[model samples]
Target chain A: ERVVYRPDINQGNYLTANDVSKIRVGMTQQQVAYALGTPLMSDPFGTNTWFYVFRQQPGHEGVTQQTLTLTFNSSGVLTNIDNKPALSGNGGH
Target chain B: EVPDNPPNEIYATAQQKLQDGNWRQAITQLEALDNRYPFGPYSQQVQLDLIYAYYKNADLPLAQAAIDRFIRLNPTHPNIDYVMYMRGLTNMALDDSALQGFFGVDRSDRDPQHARAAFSDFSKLVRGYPNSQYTTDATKRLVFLKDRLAKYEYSVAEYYTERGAWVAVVNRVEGMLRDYPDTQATRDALPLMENAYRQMQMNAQAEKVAKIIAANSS
Candidate 1:
């Protein structure tokens, strides 16, 4: 008999560099507004700031975790990008 | 002697101009009414008329400003739909102007800026007034805008992917998925994203994204 093990196929979503390239300079707030739509949460200041939030396996009762942030300049140009994956030792599925 | 009924007469004339399709004249009369009787009961009505007149005359910025002022002043007004509709109309007009050159066969270039702005405005209208009559139209425009945005993303991703710039491909695909999830273009981007991840030596991440594609498909 051949021994077989089926690895857990559940995998958390991840961000890619293409995601960051979507942010360009010289874009207006309106452009960013359309690109990302409304953020899950917006900073309370009037600095023309916005956040792009994404989640993997949303509402699932597991330890799966994934998130990314794309920051934009006042002119709607993307200025920075960050990815927050689950803790390394948590063994993300 | 100045007539004691200057405001009412002006309003009547403005309404007549509006009825006759003389938007410019109507706008002038309405402005005069607002200037002469800023606190009158007809003041708000004049402002609203001015908004419509500006819109009819294709003075989009002015029309938007007028509507914005009206919204600020009457946040709880029962006729909020009118203001929202006007805003959507202005945005649509602006979008048309930006896309005029590119939409024709003679000019195949895309105006991402205009598309993005129009998308934002339409989305706001739909989200803010889900039950409004404009919701259906807004939803349709939103889908069109998303397709345009997805095209831009795919173009960029293909550019980087062809050059073996896996990182760039990853970012572009992720942005597409995150921003335009409901778009068919995004749906088509799944394989490209997987290929990019594979090239980047991020097999784990690539597999993860594949799972999402499966889940979203069902």
Candidate 2:
């Protein structure tokens, strides 16, 4: 077998379970952003949707991905959260 | 045995390093002094020095954090304007990233978030402390900041103009003139606004803009 080196790669918000639990319905988009960091991918043409994506890879491990899709109403209040994963349950390293 | 290093000793060494422009070494000693004696007599000085050292060492994020923390902790510090100037300078330096330079892109063509942030800091400093020693420097930089913002606004207007979005063009140019008047972008954009008005078949509005452009030219 030949040796191949894979560099570790990490991208986007590393949302913790604590940070995810902080989100609540009826909160303003600014409030949610205050608790959780700014979304990694936000729609520029519209402010109603924000996508927080996370990806990590170790030198010898498979790449893992997590995402949190936040939707706000036209008035900029949080209306929905799709698949809010903590991405880490170890209480933050 | 004596303690490995005391606050006074660390402070002195850090000062020497700072004098020699050894930002890396100054940061280590200053941080050690800050950590070992968080509430000592040198707490504020340590924080300020940390900001300066981090900035000189090109650790921009840390410098920004230190500046923010210093402001939050010592809101009424006599040298607050100096700290605010440094904050603006740090973010302004962050505007020019190595990756952006490598790509050979004009800074005004991108999202000017950092420049906007810097402008806020400098503007607050100038407005809040009119007689501050740093105000002169910040005021000079403000001219360039306003022009940068104006150029970005004009770029967006140009984009809409190219797509024949006359209404959006008028709105963009109007806002640019309102916010960043007397800028080069303002001078370049008045004709475009007149053209946009004419395109929309609003002769009265176009004539009004032409008169303003004429007054501006003289």
Candidate 3:
């Protein structure tokens, strides 16, 4: 009998459509964190930035990437919500 | 050029194609098997595997046709639960790409017919096969579907709100509240109804919703 093939599935943080929808302008950092879980990328400068990315490899298909970038104010309030980003070629950077 | 193989031979090749994650190649092999052994012992399995191969190939319409045919033909097959689960997943996948592909379209603004279909499939799976192995995942997906459906309506309501269509916003948000009372959409939707009422200059109902919103959130 042939062996079963195990594909290499990559992982990333995901926010569902509802999670993104729940995000509103002027939401506090704690509330945004509660709703969106975590930023896919954190700004080392701590400028209150976040990246929410989805990297999926559907079966035999190579891969599909989606990214959402959010910006927040210094006082723990959301200033921007940009969920529609260009689809990345590989995994989202 | 290689000659066309026999049914079992093609089946063997298709089986390996599936195992090796070459679903597109596997689909052609499965098709070849179907032509020769249409009513053979492998026929049922051919249809079953064909569904997976088609789905993996991102041919949702063909996959939908295959699963529909399989389910219609085998109402009480041993693997019916798996079929039901896959049907639901197929429906969800249909919405995931096609509906969300447009930029500047809010998730809630899109027609939610596909999601409703997935919800029905998963709901049927949950009710019919409570003890099924797929039930747990079905339940989890149901949660997302509920939230997604509600969020879709919420987006539409937001559109109405922005347009100053107060009555329309009220109806949409209330519909969302009725359909998904306990979801996050509910918690966020109260304010929408409140604002719409405010827009309509209906202070009484607006006050009621605003009080509830203030009471719920810190």
List the global CA lDDT of all models: 0.65, 0.77, 0.74
Q: State fnat for each of the candidate structures.
A: 0.00, 0.00, 0.00
lDDT of 2 by residue, B65-102 (tens): 88888878787977788798899999988876667467
lDDT winner between candidates 1 and 3: 3
TM-score of 3: 0.64
- Write one digit per residue (lDDT tens) for candidate 3, span B1-218: 23386667777887898899988778877887786666887687888888878877887888888888887877788789878888899999887675444665555546899999999999999999899789788999999999899888877787767754355666677687667888987787788887755543435556778777888896
Please say which candidate is ahead in lDDT: 2 or 3: 2
Q: If ranked by lDDT, best first, what sequence of candidates would result?
A: 2, 3, 1
State the DockQ, from 0 to 1, for candidate 1.
0.03
Name the best candidate (by TM-score).
2
Q: Candidate 3 at B150: error in angstroms?
A: 1.1
- Highest-DockQ candidate: 1
Best by lDDT: 2
What DockQ does each candidate score versus the true complex, computed on alpha carbons?
0.03, 0.01, 0.01
Error of 1 at B194 (Å): 3.3
TM-score of chain B of each: 0.75, 0.90, 0.88
- The true-versus-predicted C-alpha distance at residue B172 of model 1, in Å, is 1.4
Ranking by DockQ: 1, 2, 3
The window of 10 residues in a row where model 2 chain B has the poorest summed lDDT is B197-206
lDDT of 3 at B81: 86
Task: Give the Å shift of residue B68 in candidate 2.
Answer: 1.4
